[PDB]
């Protein structure tokens, strides 16, 4: 049985997520046509729970739309059909900032809050290819989650008071390993 190597700010245990070290590069390769057109792209990190640790085994690129500044799913029923019939857990997500720096935006935090409420270990990977930087983030728990849950500020992109998020602990929360990765691109063009 795998053991706990990371904790939330409130002292809650976080099970390890094993991340294929090729995932970041593969994601950039798969979404390169969009990056070239200055369009963001997102993906879902899917996997399994085995003996008290999570394993990311699939990178899923869902049906979606985008601009230079945003990306979003458009057919979650299609995504559900895949995860349900393959019995894969949602463990986090990934997206590109084609021109921007590596950080979690207002949209990113509002989105990630819900994933992290549903799975305390849920992670958000952000790729900033024009900067050759990347990051793996989560909200501060409980304080960051509380702030985002309570937030009703207008504007697609608005700031938040103080620190709401952090880089995840590595390798304690996320450990990058040499492991199998399947790509599943559900897009129709």
């Amino acid at each position: 049985t795998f053991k706990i190597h990371a904790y939330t700010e409130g002292g809650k245990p976080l099970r390890t997520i094993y991340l294929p070290k090729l995932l970041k590069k593969v994601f950039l390769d798969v979404v390169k046509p969009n990056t070239k057109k200055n369009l963001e792209t997102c993906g879902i990190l899917c996997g399994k729970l085995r003996q008290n640790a999570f394993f990311i085994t699939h990178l899923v690129i869902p049906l979606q739309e985008a601009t230079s500044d945003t990306c979003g799913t458009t057919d979650e029923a299609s995504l559900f059909e895949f995860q349900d019939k393959h019995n894969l857990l949602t463990l986090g997500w990934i997206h590109t900032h084609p021109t921007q720096t590596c950080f979690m935006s207002s949209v990113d935090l509002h989105t990630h809050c819900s994933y992290q409420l549903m799975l305390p270990e849920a992670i958000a990977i952000v790729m900033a290819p024009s900067k050759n930087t990347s990051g793996i983030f989560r909200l501060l728990d409980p304080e960051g989650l509380q702030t985002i849950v309570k937030c009703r500020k207008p504007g697609l992109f608005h700031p938040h008071e103080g620190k709401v998020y952090t880089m995840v602990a590595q390798p304690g929360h996320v450990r990058e390993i040499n492991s199998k990765l399947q790509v599943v691109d559900l897009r129709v063009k």
Binding site: C71, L89, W93, T111, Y115
Partner: protein, 77 residues
């Protein structure tokens, strides 16, 4: 008033108290109240189809101890 279940894709099952007359939007509001997820991020699926906001549980013949499935939208910026 009856119990229904909402199973996530993360190994979590949410238990809700509802009535057959509750609309899907009412259900999403209950999920927000209890779990903190905004309704506009929620997609609910039952017996293979995504449930429309305006319709009721009884419309989809959702009865007691039925399980709905929650898939979140993804929005990035």
């Amino acid at each position: 008033s009856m119990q229904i279940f909402v199973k996530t894709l993360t190994g979590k099952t949410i238990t809700l108290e509802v009535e057959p007359s509750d609309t899907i939007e009412n259900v999403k509001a209950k999920i927000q109240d209890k779990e903190g997820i905004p309704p506009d991020q929620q997609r609910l699926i039952f017996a293979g189809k995504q449930l429309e906001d305006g319709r009721t549980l009884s419309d989809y013949n959702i009865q007691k101890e039925s399980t709905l499935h929650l898939v979140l939208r993804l929005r990035g910026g």
